[PDB]
Structure formats: C-alpha cells, structure tokens
C-alpha cells in the first residue's frame, strides 16, 4: 500500500471508493462507512464506486446496496476486471445512467449459493430462506435492468458470463467506457 | 468374535437358528448383509419365524428401507426385539416387525425423531434436497402411522424433536406389542 | 482500513456513530461498551447511533452492550443494515423507543440461544437450567421491547425465524423502515 | 459377513444372485464382471439376479458391468432395494426387459455425470468434450432402455431427480414394483 | 491370541460357559456378549454361566443390552470382578445372580454417575438433560434393588468417583463374596 | 478493531478510559493481563492516591495466581477500587469482583456472576500428584477464606456453594454479598 | 522496506514509477489501478513508468490493469526486468507503442491461460467455453499489439514459450532492448 | 510368529509356558488370565511357567494377573528375561515362593505408580487419594512377597530404581539367578 | 493491547521512568535481554536511586535468569524485589537475589522452589556430559540460594527435591524474602 495518505485514502479524498475484493461483512462495513462519510462531506457531488469483485455475502451486499440507495449523492459504478455474483448486483445498483464497465471487464451473474444441515424442518427453513432471498435479488435486478423476473431466473440458473457490451445490452450497465 | 463348534463364529451360529443381529449404525454395508440374511433364511424355510435383534442408533434412511422392504417382502414373520437402544431408523425397523411380535426388553430405550440431512450449493440444489427430505419424512410418518395406529398429525408432533421412550411407553405408543418379561 | 485527513471508523465515532459489524464476542463488547461510555462523557444529551450488521454471538457479551445502552443517559438509535441475527436482533430491539430502524432490504432473524454441555449428569443439569433461565430472560425483555406476549416470543423463536424489515416493524423489533433520503 | 455351513454373499452367488451394494469402482466392477462370466459358464440358460443398492460411481466401471450383462446369454434380472442412484440407476435399467424390479419404498435417482478438469484451456476443452460425449452415450442407452426420448432424458437429468419405485416404473427404468396366508409352522 | 487343540483361548473358555467382558463396553461388545449369553442358554438352560468382568465401563445403553439379557435368560449368570469394574462395569457386576457375585481380593470397583453431552438450542439441551437425568434415576433404582441400599444413598455415593476395595464392595452389596484362593 | 479518540492528544479508546481512572479487565486472566492491570493500578495510585479507581470486569476468569497479583495490588494501594461487572464475571473474575472497595462493588442488571471451585491438573508420579492435590486444595482454602471475609458468608457455605458451577444473577450476587449494589441507569 | 526522508516504493511513485513486482491478483491490480488513476490526476501529460517483474496470475485482474492503462491519457512505458510471464508479458506488450522495453537478460514467457472446473457436465461445459473465449480475447489483443497473426499467437502459446529480450523485440512484445 | 508342526507361542502354552512379553494392558491381562485358568483346568498339580519381558503397564490389569496367579492351585514359576519394570517386576515377585527366577543379564526396575488427574480441586483430591491408596496396596503386597518393610519399599521406589538380577535376589524380588 | 499514557508512553515504559521493571512472564533470553538493558539504563540515569523489580513469573531458562542475576549484582543501585502473584523456580531465585532487606512479597503471593529441569538424548557419553552439566548447575543455584537465604546447602537440596510451594509468610521465614508487604 504505497503512500502519497495511503493510495486508497487519497482516492477517497476525491470521492472514489474501491471495492476490490470478496464481499464480506468487514468490506461492507468499510464501504458503508465511506459512503456515509462522503455524503457528510458533500451531499450533492457524485461518488465513484470501483468494482473488481467475485461477489460474496448477500446480506453484506445488501448493506452496501441499501446505503447506496439511502444517501443523496449519485453513486457511479465502474466495473474493472470482473464483477461476479453480488459484485454484478452492486454494479447494476449504481445511479441510473452512471453504471459503467471498461471494454475488457467481465460481468457474471448466477443464483445465490448456500448450505443447510440438520433436521428436515431446519433444512426446510434454510431452503425457504435462500429461495426468498433469490426472489428478492431477482426482483431488484428486474427493476434495475428492465428484464423480467422470469428471464433473470432462467439466466442465473447457472454461471452466465457477459462481456462489457453484453452487460450493457442486458441493462446491467449503461455504457462501456471508451478510451 | 468367539467361535463355537461345524465351526461357527457366534453370529453365524445364531443365524443358523434364524436370528439376525442388527447391532450397529445402519449403512449400506449393514443393510446388504441383513437383506442377504433375510433372503437366505426365507429360502431355508419360508414359514418359520425370523428373529431380528435391534441395538442400533439408526443411520441411512435408504439403507433402512432396504431392510424394511425385504422384511415385508419375504413370507416368514420377522419378530423384532429391542435390546439396549433403538433410535431413529432403528426404531422404525423395530415398528416394522410382524404384528404381535414386536418386543423390547424392560430397560431398552426407544427414540423417535425427524430425519437428518444436509445440502450445499445453489438455491435450486438446496430446494431439491429440502423437497427430498420432506417427502422422505412424509413417507416415514405415513408408515409409522400405519404400524402404530397413531395419526400422522401426532407422529409429526412427536418426532419434531428427540423423543425418548421407555419400553413400556413404546408399547403404549404402538411401536412394540409387548415388553418381554424375564 | 482507509484514513481521512482518523481511520474511517474513528471518524464516524467523532459523529457519535458506533459500528457493530461483526460476530459479538467479549472483545467487540468491551470496545462498544467503552465507546458508549466515552460518548456519554463527551455529550450526555446528544443521541448515539449504533449500526448493526451482525450474526450475533455471545449472550453475555450481548448483555454487556445491552446493559450499557440502558445505563447511559443519551438515547441510542439502532439501525439494522445487512443482517441482524440472534443477539444482534436483540440489540436492534434494545434501541431507544421510536429510534429503532432497518433499511428496506436488511434481514432480521430471531431464534433461541445455542450452547453446549459435557460431563456428569449433574453438570448437564446445571448447564441446562442455566441456558433455560437465559432464554427466559431474553424472551421477557423481547416481550417488553416488542409488545408481544412471552408465549408468542417463545413460539416464534423455537426455530430460525427470518423477518424482512417491514415484518420486523410489524413485529415490534423496530419502529421504522428507513426510506431513502 | 456371517457364514453358512460359504460367507453369506458366496452362498447367494451359489443361487445365481449378485449383490451390488456399494459405490461402483473398478474393484466392484471387476468382481461383478467375473461373477457374471462364472455364472454364465455354470449355466448359460438360467436367469441371474443382480441386487442393486448403490449410490453409483465410476461411469467406465459401470459400463464394464453393463457390457458384460449384455454380452452373456442368461437374462440378468435387476432389483432395486434401498437406493439406485446415478450409474446405479443406469444398471437397474440395463436388466433384462420385463425383469427389472424395485421394492415399494426403494428410491431411484437420475442425474447428469460429474467430473473435473484443470490445466491449460486446450486440456479443459478436451475434458469438457469427453464428459459431454459420455453423457450423450449414457442418455442414448437410457433412451433405448426406458423408451423415453433423448430430449426428455437430457431435461430430466439436468439436476438430481428423485423417483419413487412407482415413478421409476412409469418412467420405464423398471418394469414392475415388486409387491408383498395362515399356517401353523411359525415355530 | 493363543490357540488350543482348534480353539482360540477365549472360544475355549466359552465352551466351559465363561464369557469375558474385558474391554470398554460399546455396542459391538454388547452384541457379542448378548449373542454368547443366548447361545449358552440354548446349549444348556440350567447350568450356570460365568461372566468375567475387567472393564472401565462404557455405553449405558450397551450396558443395558447385557443387563436385560442376563435377567431374561434362565441360567444364573455369576459375575467375577478381576482387575477393575468401573461405571457400567460395576453395574453389571452387581447384576449377577444373587449370591453369585464375586470379586478377587485386589480387584477394584468404582461407581459414579453417568457421563454425557449435549449441544444445540436450549430446548435440545433440555431434552438431553432430562434424558440423562432419567437414565441416572433408572440406574440408581436398579442399583438400590440389587445392593439393598436406598436410592438416596446411591445418589450421594455416585455424585463423584467412588473407589471401593473388594471387601468394601461386599459391604456395599455390589458383590456377595470376596473369592479367596484355592 | 480499537478506535481512536482525539480531544482538544490522540488516544485509543482504552487509553482514554484509563485517563479517567477506568481499568478494563475484559479477557481471560493470565500473567500478561495481570501484569497490565497491576501496572495500571500502580500508575493510577501514583497519579492520585485519593481518587477512586474503576475496575470493569467482563471476564470468564483464568489463572488463580495471576488473579491474586491483581487482588493483592488492589488491597495494597491507597485509592478505593470500585468493581463493576458487565456481561460476565466467572471464577477468578467473580473473586476480583468481590475484592472491590466495600460499598463500591457493582453489577449491571443482566450481568452474569458465576462461582465455582478452582480447576487444575497433575500428571506423573503418585507423590507428584499428591503435591499438586495438596496445592490446589490449599489454594481453594485460601480463596474460600477471603470470599468468606468479603461476603460475610461462612466458609462452610462457600465450600458447599462452589462445589459445582453456580450461576447467580446480579441481584443474587448482591444478596450473596459478592457485590453491594445492582447499578441502576443514570 | 527502506525509508527515505517515504518508503522506497512511495518515493518512486512520486516520480511516476509504478512497480508490478509480484503475482497479479485482485489486490495488486487494485493498487496499480489506483496508482495509475492518481498519477493521471497529478499530471495527464507526463509519461508513467510501469516496471514489470511478474510471473503473471489472474487474467481478470490483469485486464483491470490493461484497461486502466488504455483508458488514461498519459503514455505508460513498460519495462521488463527479471521476468514477465503469462499475464505479465501481456501487460508488457500493453505499454505505449514505442515505449515497451526489456533489459538484456530479462525473461519473457507466453503461454495459454490456465484454469479449472469441477461438477456436472454442463458446468464443465460452461467453464470450458469461458476459458476458451478468454483465450480468444487475449490472443486477439496480442495480435493487435505485436503485429503477429492470431493463428501464429495460438500456435506459439500452445505450450510454455520462453523468449529472450531480443526475441521478445523481434516478436513485437517489446519495442527496444534497453542496453547499458 | 513362526509355525510348528501351532504358532510358536501356542506350542509353548502346550507345555504350560505363558509369555508376558509386552506392555501390560487389559487385553494382555485378559489373555494371560484365560491361559492360567485353562492350564489349571488341564492339570491342577503341574507347575506353570510365566516368562516376563515387560516394561509394566496398567496396575489394575496387573492385579487381574496377580489375583489369578494366587487363586489357582498350580505353582506359577516366574522367569525374568530381558527386563521386568514396574508392574512387570511386581508380577515377577508374585511367582511361587522359591520359583522366582531371573537370567543373569536381565534387568529389574521398581518405581512408584504413574497417573494423572485433571478437573476440579475435589476431583484432583479423589484421584490423588486413589493413586496413593493404590501405592499403599502395591507396597504392602511387595513387602509380603520380598520380606522388605513397607517403609523401605516406599523409599526405594520414590524414583526409578534399576537392579541387576543378583541385586533383585538380595532384594527378595526373585529367589534365584538362573545359571547356564 | 497495552494502554498508553500521555510525552506518550506505553504503561510499562511509564513505570520504567519511575525505575520500576516488570518481570511478568516466563524467563527466556529475550526477557533477560530486555531486563538487563533496563537495569543498565537505570544505572546510567542514576547510580544511587533504588530500582524496583516486580516478579510474577513461573521461571524459565537458568542461563537467562543468571544474565539478570549477574546484572543485578553488578550495578551500583539497590534492586528491590517484589513478588506479586507467583515466583516459581528461576523466578523465586531472582526474588531472593534482591538487595538485602528489600525483598518483598504481597500477602497472597506464591513462592515455589524446585530443582532445575532439562533433557538429554544421544550416546551414553553425551548423556553423561548433560547430566554432569545440570548437576553442576544445581550445585551453583543451591550455593547462591544458601548465601541469599542463610539456609544450608544440605537443606536447600532436600527442600528442592520436589516442587515446594511456600506462602509469602513461609518465604519470609525461609529467608527468600525479608518482609511480607502489608496493605
Ligand atoms: O469515471 C470516473 C471519472 C473519470 C475521470 C475524469 N478525469 C479523470 N478521470 N472521474 C471523475 O470524474 C472524478 C473522480 N475521478 C478521478 O480520477 N479523480 C482524480 C483522482 C484523484 C486522486 C486519486 C485518484 C483519482 C474519476 C473516477 N472515475 C471512476 C473511476 C473510479 C475508479 C477507477 C477508475 C479507472 C478508470 C476510469 C475511471 C475510474
Ligand atoms: O440514522 C442515522 C442518521 C441519518 C442521517 C441524517 N443526516 C445524515 N444522516 N444520522 C444522523 O442523524 C447523525 C449521524 N449520521 C451521520 O451521517 N453523520 C454525518 C457523518 C459525519 C462523519 C462521518 C460519517 C457521518 C447519521 C447516522 N445514522 C445511522 C447510520 C449509521 C451508520 C451507517 C448508516 C447508513 C445509512 C443510514 C444511517 C446510518
Ligand atoms: O427376485 C428374486 C427372485 C424371486 C424371489 C424369491 N424370493 C424372493 N424373491 N429369486 C429367484 O427367483 C431365484 C433366486 N432367489 C432366491 O431367493 N433364491 C433362494 C436363495 C438361496 C440361498 C440364499 C439366498 C436365496 C430370488 C432372488 N431374487 C432377486 C433378489 C436378489 C437379492 C435380494 C432380494 C431381496 C428380495 C427379493 C429379491 C431379491
Ligand atoms: O461506575 C462508574 C461511574 C459511573 C458514572 C457516573 N457518571 C458517569 N458515569 N464512573 C465514574 O464515577 C467516573 C468514571 N466514569 C466515567 O464515565 N467517566 C467519564 C469518562 C470519560 C472518558 C471516557 C470514559 C468515561 C464512570 C465509570 N464507572 C464504571 C464503569 C466502567 C466501565 C464501563 C461502565 C459502563 C457503565 C457504567 C459504568 C462503567
Ligand atoms: O473372450 C473370451 C472368450 C470368449 C467368450 C465369451 N463368453 C464366453 N466365451 N473366452 C473363452 O473362449 C475361454 C474363457 N472364457 C470363459 O468365459 N470361460 C468360462 C469360464 C469358466 C469359469 C469361470 C469363468 C469363465 C472366455 C473369456 N474371454 C475373455 C473375457 C475375460 C473376462 C471377462 C469377459 C467378459 C466378457 C467377454 C469376455 C471376457
Ligand atoms: O425372542 C426370541 C425367541 C424367544 C426366546 C427363547 N429363548 C430366549 N428367547 N427365540 C426363539 O423363539 C427362537 C430363537 N431364539 C433362540 O434363543 N434360539 C436358540 C439359539 C440357538 C443357538 C444360538 C443362539 C440361540 C430366540 C430368539 N429371540 C429373539 C432374540 C434374539 C437375540 C437376542 C435375544 C436376547 C434375549 C431374548 C431374545 C433374543
Ligand atoms: O515497593 C515499591 C514502592 C512502594 C510505593 C511507594 N509509593 C507507592 N508505592 N515504590 C517506590 O518506593 C518507588 C517506585 N514506586 C512507585 O509506585 N512509584 C510511582 C509510580 C510512578 C509511575 C508509574 C507507576 C508508579 C513503588 C514501586 N515499588 C515496587 C513495586 C514494583 C512493581 C509493582 C508493585 C506493586 C505493588 C507494590 C510495589 C510494587
Ligand atoms: O525354567 C523352565 C524349565 C527349564 C527347562 C528344563 N528343560 C528344558 N527347559 N522348563 C520346565 O521345567 C518345563 C517347561 N519348559 C520347557 O522348556 N518345556 C519344553 C518346551 C516345549 C515346547 C515349547 C517350549 C518349551 C521349561 C520352561 N522354564 C521356564 C522358561 C519359560 C520361558 C522361557 C525360558 C527361557 C529359558 C529358560 C527357562 C524358560
Ligand atoms: O468362578 C469361577 C468358577 C469357580 C472356579 C473354578 N476354578 C476357579 N474358580 N468356575 C466354575 O465353576 C466353572 C468354570 N470355571 C473354570 O475354571 N472351568 C474350567 C475351564 C475349562 C476350560 C477353560 C477354562 C476353564 C470357573 C470360572 N469361574 C469364573 C472365572 C472366570 C474367568 C477367570 C477366572 C479366574 C479366577 C477365578 C475364576 C474365574
Ligand atoms: O562493560 C561495559 C562498560 C562498563 C560498565 C558497566 N556498568 C557500568 N560501567 N560500559 C562503558 O564503559 C560504557 C558503556 N556502558 C554503559 O553502561 N553506559 C551507560 C548507558 C547509557 C544508556 C543506556 C545504557 C547504558 C557500559 C557497557 N559495558 C558493556 C556492557 C554492555 C551491555 C550490557 C552490559 C551489562 C553489564 C556490564 C556491561 C555491559
Ligand atoms: Mg445514491
Ligand atoms: Mg415378513
Ligand atoms: Mg440509553
Ligand atoms: Mg443378459
Ligand atoms: Mg440369569
Ligand atoms: Mg484499595
Ligand atoms: Mg496510456
Ligand atoms: Mg498359584
Ligand atoms: Mg545491585
């Protein structure tokens, strides 16, 4: 982590947040904290969320998602390298018209992953829970992309890799960012 | 394992007298052995009673149903006798014995509960696994109802959590017919 | 991790925001208790804001936080973001009356305490009596805090019970779903 | 394994009964192939009985059994007891026409083949092509054996598909569900 | 394991109606001993059986499998403690035919309350606690019947590890006689 | 994990509390923890020999000797040491709770206090086992005598009540004499 | 890491030098992307120097760096020192035209992408198709950057292909061997 | 184990020779107890010969063997070959009076019992009392078998006490050193 | 997590400013090196003022302990020793090494003395050398302990054959300390 401020701290000064890892609670807590801080500094100026992430925890993803929608500033999203799973969800959650990917960036969508062990009743509860979570994700993706819930369901049944151009056509981003 | 003398290990000697020992966790190996023994004993004599000793914590449901189905299939009555413990699929098999010939010894423990399992992967895979174990439970409960004379509704309630029964309670419940007195 | 002009968490603490963003253990509880006591000393009148994104954890560590909240003079707002499960949802419900919040897609889960015991029968008995008393304590406070009967709380926490933000509001675990500003 | 004055499995083999009661690997396949060939040599006309309680296993091992069954003259009856999954359900369906059975509470599961591949892109490609060809081969034979279309088999095996004995019969994986008087010779 | 002519040494002792419980009690051991007891009854319903006990104890349900089989069969089962009988081992020592429970002079007898475990939800812990407490009550009641001591005294005396000499075990009522040299 | 505070100097939160004479015993008691707490007690006495010190206890207990390092330092120094149980005080933790200045031992309402007999181990020769047994028995006699003095309960009662794990509510800890007061909200 | 009064790496960044001296993963990509952004913001006209001593690593992480290089205004010079293998050599070739360098004894290796897949046939199919497409993408860009045909790139990357600095130049992966 | 036309050990048992050639655990004790009772049943008058090459082991398992020796009618000769340590040397001393032997270079070691305890103070107390009572029992019987005082045995077993065969004879652990 | 006092010191450094050294761990070479360095520094600051060595230690390395012992004896200032919690083995040896009249324990502190521990593997000759070494070391420890306590070497040898736990009061009567420090 080079110094100038460490490099990430320096970027944050210019309202740039870097989501560059698996999404877990720690990452979500930091990005939530950064979003709230930037709102407090200036409630009008755009924020820039860089996304290079293979995804991760859905609830941690939703911590970031809800904070983005809560605050006043537009949050631009820029996919660089890869946005997969909850990462592609957050990519699609950026301000309308301000969701971007660079030309060689990859976007992947798939259904949520999980686990359950124990009694039949416990398995049932866990199964109902991840199914409801999927419905929730699909509903929001539908609203964000313009695709039907039915299409999202079908298209996320297995790993679905998209180019930046394909992500744009899908409605996950608004624009491929040109040199 | 002791030998008796015609030289038999003790278990083989009991089998000569139509006694089968289910004395471990139920897995596919155990089921294959017990199924083989049942089919052998039917061939040896299609009419004479078979005696199935049960000291088991249960195990695989499918392995258990291998034994269950073979018992119901063959012509001989299969007596069941709980000694020590019959839990889960073990208690299911105890209840599967010929009507009137299901026993426990006085200090034997019988435990009933819902089936256990696991699933990891995609939501759709979790769904399939969940639906499978729920159907499995419905299947078990339906047969338990038929074998005990209890309603399915009561079986469901009574198996929600671990439910330990004395021999005498197992009799009242309809899991066995009699407590075998000295 | 990032720094401003303060690490980001310390910067939020300057504005009376405490982040409960992990499993609750004694270390987390000690930290949050300390922050709560400091904030009271700095300003006994201004509200405090407790962010909760937690799968829960130690009950006694949870009660450390709970008792400090109730002890101090300032109102402690609770805001569920991401997930509040188990002792996490308990603390969510323990916020100042009228100032318990969840964001729209936040998840709230309630269930019964988990534990373990091994040894002699008498030791198992002691352990069982303990966790049962702990559950009664938890359920009574939840009853008081939500307006639900103890009997309903008992039934509703028998197994894992997942609630949406709106359901958590209807239940009385929170007062309001926080809508976009 | 108890003894009868023969270990129990050997005693059953005497009556032309083969027990497939485990995961299918090369050892299991070598054993069953040898038993089939032996039984044919003893008597080329009498039926053989293949018991199946198996979660499946190796596809190549399974095809060793499959091909030996179809090679020998005797009919090989199949009976599912407990569970027949994956390659196990394939072998269940490979029994002599009219002589494939399941007991009432037996479980039958069908799904697509599982595998792995690591290394260079071209190596991954080769592995992918190989398992995809293997699936086509399995599906074609299942189609012939069940009377279901390849298209239906493909759709039905995309994920784990659990069938009851009765469902397996209507699917054509088996021919019949084996269903179960007073006397005074009980003792 | 040496051979005699062809018997392994233990099988030779079984020929003379001697069963060796010389290990921790688990389901496998219980199944073996049960099988031996039933075989010996079938061989001769009237001649005494000798159960050698050198055991630190083990599974209570496994122990009860042995216990109930002893009480069920017609022949008297003598018990002889050699080395150590602890826990379920001492329970089975006490379960021998009245007047035919023995220990050799330097044999050790230890009684204590049952051990176990529980994890999971409070309700699950409660179920496990009620179960082991009921098991202890069952053990204590039978020990009371077998020793002539009150249930309350058994409870106190098994609260922690309680080591007895052979003579002390006789005075307690766990055995009838200390077997002195020939 | 540990946030910083800045006033008109920069402090980690724990250092800031120490500035106001608050010491945190918030972990298992071992030699390192005891060393830190002893050092803090000495320092605070030196800073002011008359002003109260506040010892927060959220601890499952731990080393008896390490506990006695803290105990003896509390008794040695001139300032009253208030004890405040928050979360849990168990074993040596509850011993130190009971060790606070008379009238200034507290617990918050849902704090858990647990008392039991000391734990230990010994392996090797019979005579080595004997030495270890005599040691832990003497140690228990020492603990119980002090507990008796601190609570007003008889040694006989303490012996009985610590035979196995004994979970007390804050209110029960007060009636037992382990604390003086259940701390009500400010 | 020595200090200058800056740690050494921070000191080099002050003079618009970025050090890629490890395996390429997401964390490394994130750092280099950030440095590239920062240096653009400091001065959009002055050249940036990217040192490459890397065995390669994540293709997606490498494309984060690749795309950021092509996005920003400043020319990014690339200098291979020690080794540039796999995605490392890809990024070496991605430097500003006329400003891709290697020192005389630096090693350059090109090969096809590596990966893995396990599970159902259809999952293996998806993984296979993905890495094959990734290889097409890599090869197409290499073709554009080197001036070699896609067909030649495919052949030459079928197995590990070690090049000297001089060989890398005549291949078109670099423009010049930096001579003492 | 070679075969004779019997495994070698079974052949020796035919001539009333029992091999205690390992650590003493419950399995070993059960086997030896069984052999002793069998040999008594075969002939209640003829001597038995117990070979001892053992580092000792479980005290209770040792007492299983000990009590069986004293119980049966036949004299049980003991012959230490190689090493008899701890419970091994206790059993050596337990042979029929006048018929306890060691070969010249055999090693005899006596020491106090080993054990362990963990948990609550009162549990440690119970375990301590137990092992102390066991040592009193061992020492009382050793005293009876050797003619040495309980006080002397206590002192001599405080730590590992290695004896030659000749020293074992003067100690009273054996009667005779068996000469070629 | 060591707290800071503010001129910003961690708590241990703050105590060192008042000439208090804290030995609160197993004695190894690192611990000895630090304590030796502290003793030297304090002597350099002021060669006349007392130093205070707090001891809560289960002991450890004999040679490390002797690095501390020798440095205490070498420097001009009196080094007081105060046993808090536990002083075992080499820890109790260092407690006894304090300036005469200035060795203390708090009332519930525990002092344990025993013989040194060690190990040896290899050839008979190597075992012999190791044995002779540890036996010499014990003679050295016992002789110094005799000088420090006023007890005979013969008594020290007997009393250290096995773990010997002393109360603070007993440690005083034994001569390991001068005084039990009363509140
Ligand atoms: O789309 C934009 C635009 C594009 C722009 C215009 N002029 C320079 N860059 N933008 C702004 O309009 C203001 C903030 N900003 C700065 O660079 N600000 C300067 C700066 C200062 C200190 C450190 C870093 C950057 C950028 C951030 N992003 C999003 C962005 C985020 C993360 C990584 C990226 C990689 C490649 C392209 C975009 C990226
Ligand atoms: O409910 C509130 C309200 C909401 C508000 C009103 N005006 C701005 N925000 N609130 C206050 O009323 C004062 C303190 N504060 C600041 O933002 N203060 C400004 C600030 C300064 C410096 C750093 C960060 C924030 C917030 C904290 N929270 C709780 C809270 C915690 C953590 C993460 C959250 C994410 C989303 C919503 C809420 C969050
Ligand atoms: O379906 C059949 C038929 C019909 C039949 C007769 N009794 C039950 N089912 N069959 C024959 O017609 C000849 C061979 N045979 C014998 O039982 N032969 C007698 C015998 C002798 C010695 C040992 C075992 C069995 C059986 C074998 N099988 C297949 C089979 C295999 C394995 C386990 C099974 C469990 C349950 C039902 C069938 C099973
Ligand atoms: O009982 C008390 C009393 C109670 C009081 C009276 N007015 C405010 N609080 N007390 C003092 O009388 C002086 C020191 N102090 C401060 O708060 N001082 C102010 C301060 C300044 C800077 C940081 C923290 C605290 C408190 C500490 N404690 C003990 C204590 C310790 C740890 C955590 C606790 C959590 C809940 C209750 C008590 C706690
Ligand atoms: O190709 C042949 C030929 C031709 C043949 C095929 N079916 C019957 N005959 N052959 C002989 O001409 C003599 C030996 N033999 C017997 O079966 N002999 C009878 C016999 C007796 C006893 C035990 C086993 C087999 C066979 C062995 N093989 C090779 C072979 C090996 C292993 C498994 C096989 C499975 C399927 C086909 C071939 C197999
Ligand atoms: O309930 C019965 C009845 C009734 C009976 C007669 N004597 C004891 N019980 N029964 C028969 O009617 C014929 C077969 N049989 C023999 O003992 N047969 C004799 C024999 C011969 C050779 C070896 C063993 C047993 C018994 C088996 N069982 C079931 C049984 C199984 C396993 C362990 C048990 C332990 C305790 C009680 C029952 C047990
Ligand atoms: O015996 C003494 C005496 C006793 C005294 C006098 N006034 C207060 N205490 N003493 C001095 O005479 C000068 C140095 N000093 C300070 O405390 N100085 C003040 C101070 C300043 C800064 C930080 C801490 C303490 C103390 C150190 N020790 C030794 C000592 C060491 C370690 C831990 C101990 C725990 C309990 C008792 C003693 C301890
Ligand atoms: O002291 C004796 C004497 C000595 C004797 C006299 N003639 C031969 N040997 N003795 C008997 O008086 C009868 C039994 N016996 C046989 O050798 N019997 C013959 C035999 C037959 C088959 C296998 C082994 C031995 C021996 C056993 N022992 C004890 C003994 C035990 C174990 C190992 C020993 C090693 C060395 C010396 C003694 C040993
Ligand atoms: O108490 C008895 C009684 C009385 C008796 C006779 N001699 C010694 N004790 N008993 C019989 O009345 C018939 C069966 N039997 C034989 O020895 N039978 C002879 C025999 C033949 C073949 C092999 C072994 C033993 C003995 C078994 N036991 C129990 C017993 C079990 C195990 C190990 C023991 C060790 C020491 C004492 C007793 C032991
Ligand atoms: O032999 C010497 C001599 C003699 C001396 C020792 N004590 C007083 N005088 N010496 C000097 O003549 C100049 C440097 N110095 C200081 O102490 N200087 C003062 C000082 C200032 C600040 C910090 C530490 C020491 C010492 C260092 N050494 C070597 C030495 C090294 C390391 C640890 C030792 C431990 C014990 C003895 C010697 C040690
Ligand atoms: Mg916004
Ligand atoms: Mg039947
Ligand atoms: Mg409040
Ligand atoms: Mg055929
Ligand atoms: Mg009987
Ligand atoms: Mg005080
Ligand atoms: Mg550029
Ligand atoms: Mg004798
Ligand atoms: Mg000095």
UniProtKB/Swiss-Prot annotation, chain E:
GO BP, one annotated term: protein quality control for misfolded or incompletely synthesized proteins
Single GO MF descriptor: ATP-dependent peptidase activity
KW Ligase (keyword) present: no
Listed Pfam families: CLP_protease
GO CC annotations, alphabetized: cytoplasm; endopeptidase Clp complex
Keywords recorded for this protein, A-Z: Cytoplasm, Hydrolase, Protease, Serine protease
Catalytic activity: Hydrolysis of proteins to small peptides in the presence of ATP and magnesium. alpha-casein is the usual test substrate. In the absence of ATP, only oligopeptides shorter than five residues are hydrolyzed (such as succinyl-Leu-Tyr-|-NHMec, and Leu-Tyr-Leu-|-Tyr-Trp, in which cleavage of the -Tyr-|-Leu- and -Tyr-|-Trp bonds also occurs)
CDD domains named among the record's database cross-references: S14_ClpP_2
Homology family: Belongs to the peptidase S14 family.
Subunit annotation: Fourteen ClpP subunits assemble into 2 heptameric rings which stack back to back to give a disk-like structure with a central cavity, resembling the structure of eukaryotic proteasomes.
HAMAP family assigned to the protein according to its UniProt record, in alphabetical order: ClpP
Name of the protein in its database record: ATP-dependent Clp protease proteolytic subunit
Source species taxonomy: Bacteria, Bacillati, Bacillota, Bacilli, Bacillales
Curated annotation (Swiss-Prot), chain F:
Keywords: Cytoplasm, Hydrolase, Protease, Serine protease
EC number: 3.4.21.92
Record field: catalytic activity: Hydrolysis of proteins to small peptides in the presence of ATP and magnesium. alpha-casein is the usual test substrate. In the absence of ATP, only oligopeptides shorter than five residues are hydrolyzed (such as succinyl-Leu-Tyr-|-NHMec, and Leu-Tyr-Leu-|-Tyr-Trp, in which cleavage of the -Tyr-|-Leu- and -Tyr-|-Trp bonds also occurs)
InterPro entries per record: ClpP, ClpP/crotonase-like_dom_sf, ClpP/TepA, ClpP_His_AS, ClpP_Ser_AS
GO molecular function: ATP-dependent peptidase activity; ATPase binding; serine-type endopeptidase activity
Enzyme class: hydrolase
Active site: 91, 116
Localization terms from the record: Cytoplasm
Domain of life: Bacteria
Pfam families assigned to the protein according to its UniProt record, in alphabetical order: CLP_protease
Major site of localization recorded for this protein: cytoplasm
Subunit details: Fourteen ClpP subunits assemble into 2 heptameric rings which stack back to back to give a disk-like structure with a central cavity, resembling the structure of eukaryotic proteasomes.
Role noted for this protein: Cleaves peptides in various proteins in a process that requires ATP hydrolysis. Has a chymotrypsin-like activity. Plays a major role in the degradation of misfolded proteins.
Protein name as annotated: ATP-dependent Clp protease proteolytic subunit
Organism this protein belongs to: Staphylococcus aureus (strain Mu3 / ATCC 700698)
Curated annotation (Swiss-Prot), chain I:
InterPro entries recorded: ClpP, ClpP/crotonase-like_dom_sf, ClpP/TepA, ClpP_His_AS, ClpP_Ser_AS
Any one cellular-component term (Gene Ontology): endopeptidase Clp complex
Active-site residue list: 89, 114
Principal location: cytoplasm
One record GO biological process: protein quality control for misfolded or incompletely synthesized proteins
Entry keyword set: Cytoplasm, Hydrolase, Protease, Serine protease
Annotated GO MF terms: ATP-dependent peptidase activity; ATPase binding; serine-type endopeptidase activity
Oligomer and partners: Fourteen ClpP subunits assemble into 2 heptameric rings which stack back to back to give a disk-like structure with a central cavity, resembling the structure of eukaryotic proteasomes.
Family: Belongs to the peptidase S14 family.
Name of the protein this chain belongs to: ATP-dependent Clp protease proteolytic subunit
Annotated gene: clpP
